[PDB]
Amino acid sequence: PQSKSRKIAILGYRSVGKSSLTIQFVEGQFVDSYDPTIENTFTKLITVNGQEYHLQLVDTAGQDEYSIFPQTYSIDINGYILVYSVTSIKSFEVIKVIHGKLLDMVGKVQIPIMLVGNKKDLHMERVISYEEGKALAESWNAAFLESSAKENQTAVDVFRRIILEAEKLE
Numbered sequence: 001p002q003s004k005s006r007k008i009a010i011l012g013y014r015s016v017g018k019s020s021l022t023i024q025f026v027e028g029q030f031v032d033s034y035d036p037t038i039e040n041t042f043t044k045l046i047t048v049n050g051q052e053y054h055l056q057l058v059d060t061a062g063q064d065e066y067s068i069f070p071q072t073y074s075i076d077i078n079g080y081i082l083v084y085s086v087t088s089i090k091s092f093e094v095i096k097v098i099h100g101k102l103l104d105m106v107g108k109v110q111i112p113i114m115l116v117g118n119k120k121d122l123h124m125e126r127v128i129s130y131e132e133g134k135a136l137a138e139s140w141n142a143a144f145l146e147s148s149a150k151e152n153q154t155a156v157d158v159f160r161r162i163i164l165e166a167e168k169l170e
């Protein structure tokens, strides 16, 4: 089928760069203008392994330990991107909770899940090691990748990987 449509949800704690990472991929630039997000949606077109896709990305509002996991992000979502900031132990802690809830909500369905450690560029502020987040991604039997919302190639690698990870379960 010349084109396929997939809906991806980008979840995580606030300020980690869910939007930055999303816009970088979608528009190609890096915005510094920190705007708390309500919910944005961009429809990006990208091809993976010859197959072109129609990606409907849902850049969600940041949540935390005690926040209801939106039931709509529980249905009709083909892939999930759970991003944390390697410069924040709190984001790391929180993503484990969001992941927990997410799994409960969705019940038992083979939905691709990948873990992203954002802000690899800010070397002087990293507190989470690569090997650590990596280990988490393995415990979830999920994909892992680190990234910078200022390093397009890596942002693109993120959205490519999830689809790779998805067409694998289908």
Ligand SMILES: Nc1nc2c(ncn2[C@@H]2O[C@H](COP(=O)(O)OP(=O)(O)NP(=O)(O)O)[C@@H](O)[C@H]2O)c(=O)[nH]1
Residues within 6 Å of the ligand: 012, 013, 014, 015, 016, 017, 018, 019, 020, 021, 031, 032, 033, 034, 035, 036, 037, 038, 060, 061, 062, 063, 118, 119, 120, 121, 122, 147, 148, 149, 150, 151
């Ligand atoms: N140096 C650097 N800064 C980054 C990176 N990703 C995001 N940031 C910065 O971190 C801040 C928050 O990013 P943003 O995308 O708004 O985070 P968010 O998770 O979408 N926040 P919210 O949940 O409130 O909607 C911005 O000022 C942004 O420029 C990165 O890879 N490197």
Ligand SMILES: [Mg+2]
Residues within 6 Å of the ligand: 018, 019, 035, 036, 037, 038, 059, 060, 061, 062
């Ligand atoms: Mg946002």
